Amino acid sequence: SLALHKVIMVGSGGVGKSALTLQFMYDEFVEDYEPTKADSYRKKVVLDGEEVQIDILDTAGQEDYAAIRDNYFRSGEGFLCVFSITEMESFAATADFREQILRVKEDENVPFLLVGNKSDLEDKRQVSVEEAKNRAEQWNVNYVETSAKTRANVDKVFFDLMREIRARL
Ligand SMILES: Nc1nc2c(ncn2[C@@H]2O[C@H](COP(=O)(O)OP(=O)(O)O)[C@@H](O)[C@H]2O)c(=O)[nH]1
Ligand SMILES: [Ca+2]
Ligand SMILES: [Cl-]
Ligand SMILES: [Cl-]
Ligand SMILES: [Cl-]
Ligand code: NA
């Protein structure tokens, strides 16, 4: 009887998909989570006063068979597209995840946030706020910077994505 919001974490390696997920789920910064391990998490949460369930698929890039990975995308209702602000190549990689999602969901308004993680490493920044905001503007998505280490904006990205799912679906 509860809304079930199906969230999928995407992004290239080491950007913080798992750390964000585990901070959200378990209030812990986890620094050694197996890079090849994908997992699903489910939690009851109160979204704007409504009890809902969030399901998070923390993807780990291991499924290379395109039909299978497209099936995983098709199941998702919203996407956190994560890059690390400290790795420009991970920002460049977001374009591919966007295209993969769009090919399957066929809706440019699919619930989607662009997430610049590792905001606590400003001294290592390789991706400017300006360029990330410009990309988000091009895609008509919001850009949020997070830190799985300090928990900055972690609840925000999950809740705001659920708000998009709620509004759009
Ligand atoms: N300083 C800092 N390190 C982070 C952050 N998020 C992840 N890390 C570190 O980056 C590494 C990779 O994170 P992980 O979540 O496993 O990356 P994934 O491959 O995208 O799942 C780990 O050592 C984390 O501790 C963050 O926000 N800040
Ligand atoms: Ca991971
Ligand atoms: Cl796995
Ligand atoms: Cl799983
Ligand atoms: Cl609570
Ligand atoms: Na612009």
125 lines ligand 1 (CB under 6 A): no
Q: 102 near 29, Cβ under 8 Å?
A: no
Which atom of ligand 1 is closest in space to residue 119's alpha carbon?
A: 27
Give the tokens for residue 8. 């999928």
| Residue 134 labelled as part of a binding site | no
Domain carrying residue 165: 1-169
- CA 136–ligand 2 middle distance (angstroms): 23
35 lines ligand 1 (CB under 6 A): yes
Number of domains in the chain: 1
| Residue 31 labelled as part of a binding site | yes
Measured on CA atoms in the order 49, 7, 121, 88, is the torsion positive or negative?
negative
Q: For residue 161, which of 3, 6, 1, 2 has the smallest C-alpha distance?
A: 6
Q: Determine the Cα–Cα distance for residues 169 and 166; give it in Å rounded to an integer.
A: 6
CATH number at residue 1: 3.40.50.300
Give the tokens for residue 152. 């900055």
| Cβ-proximal residues to 40 (8 Å cutoff; 6+ apart), any chain | 55, 56, 57, 58
Q: 49 near 33, Cβ under 8 Å?
A: no
- Print the SS3 string covering the chain: CCEEEEEEEECCCCCCHHHHHHHHHHCCCCCCCCCCCCEEEEEEEEECCEEEEEEEEECCCCCCCHHHHHHHHHHCCEEEEEEECCCHHHHHHHHHHHHHHHHHHCCCCCCEEEEEECCCCHHHCCCCHHHHHHHHHHHCCEEEECCCCCCCCHHHHHHHHHHHHHHHC
Residue nearest to atom 11 of ligand 1 (CA): 14
Q: What is the largest CA-CA distance in the chain?
A: 47
Experimental technique behind these coordinates: X-ray
- CA 77–ligand 6 middle distance (angstroms): 26
17 lines ligand 1 (CB under 6 A): yes
**CA–CA–CA angle 163, 144, 113 (5° rounding):** 50
Residue nearest to atom 12 of ligand 1 (CA): 14
Q: Determine the Cα–Cα distance for residues 154 and 150; give it in Å rounded to an integer.
A: 9
| Cβ-proximal residues to 71 (8 Å cutoff; 6+ apart), any chain | none
Q: 145 near 129, Cβ under 8 Å?
A: yes
Q: Determine the Cα–Cα distance for residues 15 and 95; give it in Å rounded to an integer.
A: 15
Instruction: Resolution in Å, one decimal, please.
Output: 1.2
Give the tokens for residue 166. 């709620």
Q: Determine the Cα–Cα distance for residues 11 and 82; give it in Å rounded to an integer.
A: 5
| Residue 143 labelled as part of a binding site | no
131 lines ligand 1 (CB under 6 A): no
